[PDB]
Design a binder for this molecule. Sequence first.
Ligand SMILES: O=C(O)CN(CC(=O)N[C@@H](Cc1cnc[nH]1)C(=O)O)Cc1ccccc1
Ligand SMILES: [Zn+2]
Length: 953
Amino acid sequence: NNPAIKRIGNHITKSPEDKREYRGLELANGIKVLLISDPTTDKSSAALDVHIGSLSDPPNIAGLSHFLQHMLFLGTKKYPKENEYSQFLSEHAGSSNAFTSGEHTNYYFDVSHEHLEGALDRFAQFFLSPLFDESAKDREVNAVDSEHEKNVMNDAWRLFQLEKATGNPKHPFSKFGTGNKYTLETRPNQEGIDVRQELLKFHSAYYSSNLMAVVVLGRESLDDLTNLVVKLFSEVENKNVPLPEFPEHPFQEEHLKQLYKIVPIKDIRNLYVTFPIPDLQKYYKSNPGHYLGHLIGHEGPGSLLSELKSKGWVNTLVGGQKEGARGFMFFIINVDLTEEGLLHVEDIILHMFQYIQKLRAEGPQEWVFQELKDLNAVAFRFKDKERPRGYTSKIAGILHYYPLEEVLTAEYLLEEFRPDLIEMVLDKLRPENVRVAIVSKSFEGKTDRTEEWYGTQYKQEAIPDEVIKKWQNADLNGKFKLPTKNEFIPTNFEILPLEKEATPYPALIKDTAMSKLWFKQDDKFFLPKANLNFEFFSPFAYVDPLHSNMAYLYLELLKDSLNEYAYAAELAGLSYDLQNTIYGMYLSVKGYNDKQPILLKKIIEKMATFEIDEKRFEIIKEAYMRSLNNFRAEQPHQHAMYYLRLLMTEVAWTKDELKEALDDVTLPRLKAFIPQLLSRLHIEALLHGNITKQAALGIMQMVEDTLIEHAHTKPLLPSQLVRYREVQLPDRGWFVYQQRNEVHNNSGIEIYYQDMQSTSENMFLELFAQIISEPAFNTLRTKEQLGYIVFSGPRRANGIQGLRFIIQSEKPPHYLESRVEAFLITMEKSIEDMTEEAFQKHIQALAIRRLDKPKKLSAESAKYWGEIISQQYNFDRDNTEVAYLKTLTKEDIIKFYKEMLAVDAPRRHKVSVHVLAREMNLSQAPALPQPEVIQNMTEFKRGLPLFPLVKPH
Ligand SMILES: O=C(O)CN(CC(=O)N[C@@H](Cc1cnc[nH]1)C(=O)O)Cc1ccccc1
Ligand SMILES: [Zn+2]
């Protein structure tokens, strides 16, 4: 018997493939706990989920729960140092984060498996005795505000909050969850409110043990984990807080039958249809929501999306249930619009109700239900091993909704067939309770309303009774055929025997002029899956902006035409990735290896015999134009990274150049482009997973034979296989490129300190980056509060590497950069003052991060694929570079800094991208040289040397 524990669960149902061991238990204070033992893991992890979220914010203090979530990381009674947590994790190869939904606040971390307990103590202190330091508050409010301002110009966010603003204003749903400087500091100060003490009341009141779930994953035995969790979490007090429920829908009748005309930030065209539904959560065993969402959202032949696309009205459609809260959900149907579809919105919706009516006519179909059940069963049984962090987080989340023994299977396995529930939801989908939203720039100037928090321009209308009735009298329709049996359902899950000459690394099993084939039979995971990667090399992909555009449009048209067919396979766990690149095309095929050669053959066959459809052509090209235009509205740091890419790459076409050259792209010219693109090719492939060498060779030769047969493809010259170099900066040089964002009123910046990627250089850079990793965050954000987005680390491109800082701040870069340099000096000092053992802890942390084994096939394949597309082929890079990493001493790093990075360093290579805003104590900052301002990227690149290329392994 144990008094600290209320109950121990039964056997937790898991996949037969899952070797991890589980134990569920509820503590005396009512904390639901899942323990995961996995002796083979490198990183241990833990997560805690509170069942309180932004919907429980005080009406006078918006975002208090979010702010609290931020503040917990900044000191507790037992661990008072503001960054003890993040420093501990960083020093022990760990990371951490958290988030806040309307109903939940979820905290999570990972760390080296040998410091799991140490991390977990500090973690546990968050829910017992948090400090909420006043200085910490006055500072972090800036970080939260900056987070919000980041989201302000984001269309998705604006719409997200708009839906809340258009509902019952007295309903908690209408609350603004993020919070900012105004709502957290300014307004409360105006109203005498002591924020710290509001935070303490919220924590004390709502952070009760009875509203908490905990998941812990480690190498230790289940009994050890038990003892640990009991020890650290039995002291959490139970205040028996009643679980907040929201039975009343935020959308009642006068909020129904409404139209909303909305002005976006980007040039997009969208249609959002919404139905209020009850909370279907409790029916998870049958789940009508998925049923109707699968049908409505289906993209196969005979489908709604198929029809509406045939009329050239829409391009993409999503449909199904979206969650609201405990007491209410939604059922949405959203499409993107063409220029024509925008003028036929009513008709589109009528078609929607026609499809719905067709469903009502044919009723619930059990065979459909079983198809869903079996597919989910396969998915669950052969589910890839998750990263411990996201795993513990997810499980801690879903512990509040499901019985212990079912927490793993609950979201996957279906048991009950409920025609009644299906028909009931289906009955709730009717014009009398519909909400319609149009998002288009065509409403600019013609709106009469403004959303408070994001400043969204919109107009509300009542939908004419007449129209409602045309939609009620919706006929069923002959343009629609319900989906048939999915042919791509896998039947062969046999894991092929491991060959005698099988290699631990990808072997080069083909080296012809036509193709270079790398292969590996999976030795670790033993699933019935496979990954098939293909890099097609053709100089005509990126020879000029015109051909670049044509490549993009070619592959987009291809994918579009094959969507209807591929969707079945997608549902059946088999998906494909296809897109153009600076070097030519890229095509990956991932999933169950059973029907893979079928899908692939179809891909290549269609690829080589593609007949372009003109409607599709000019619609897609219009979309692409809008897209290029819409890069304008991207965030300042994305702008900075973009500009820097352009500066440091030998050959690169700007989006303005692309856009300009896009008008000259005619149908005959593209139709002429494709065969010349396919005329001469090279193919470097990586086939990895549950397949034999002979199978792999057969596949590669199948693709080659298809291309030769239908496109008369011939090999490419070896010398012709070009590669782009990186611009070489001069010693002690500083260059600055300046632009303006025009959309965000927020400045972005990237600082880049440039040699090539040799083992030594690599580990110098990476170790330094490790040492400064968390101090940079703590200094630039936690202390100085420059922005929400403060990033630092290695930059790798074209075989050449450097150290980058990226910041998105309210302040100007001419000052921001100064703060960065000052910080750099601070690091020069702290390295000289840190102990050799601390140094060795950084070394160890980085070593662990580098030696962390992948847990799923795709990750391994990703490592290999990196090694291949970089054309370095160092498959044993981890072992080699870690071995050399532990060789290093403190002053290898000291002279590295003093020679390459210091402000007066002899080989300092500094490039700064300054993206200005729309409208434009502390440490000692060093006096900087006068920068040379780039006023033309090409002239700049012509005036400078180009780096060499890394030699393979
Ligand atoms: O990504 C999720 O899991 C969430 N969504 C689920 C969904 O609707 N899945 C659809 C996907 C689909 C693709 N094409 C047709 N349907 C399905 O039934 O397969 C809902 C949602 C909520 C909030 C904002 C966006 C979307
Ligand atoms: Zn946040």
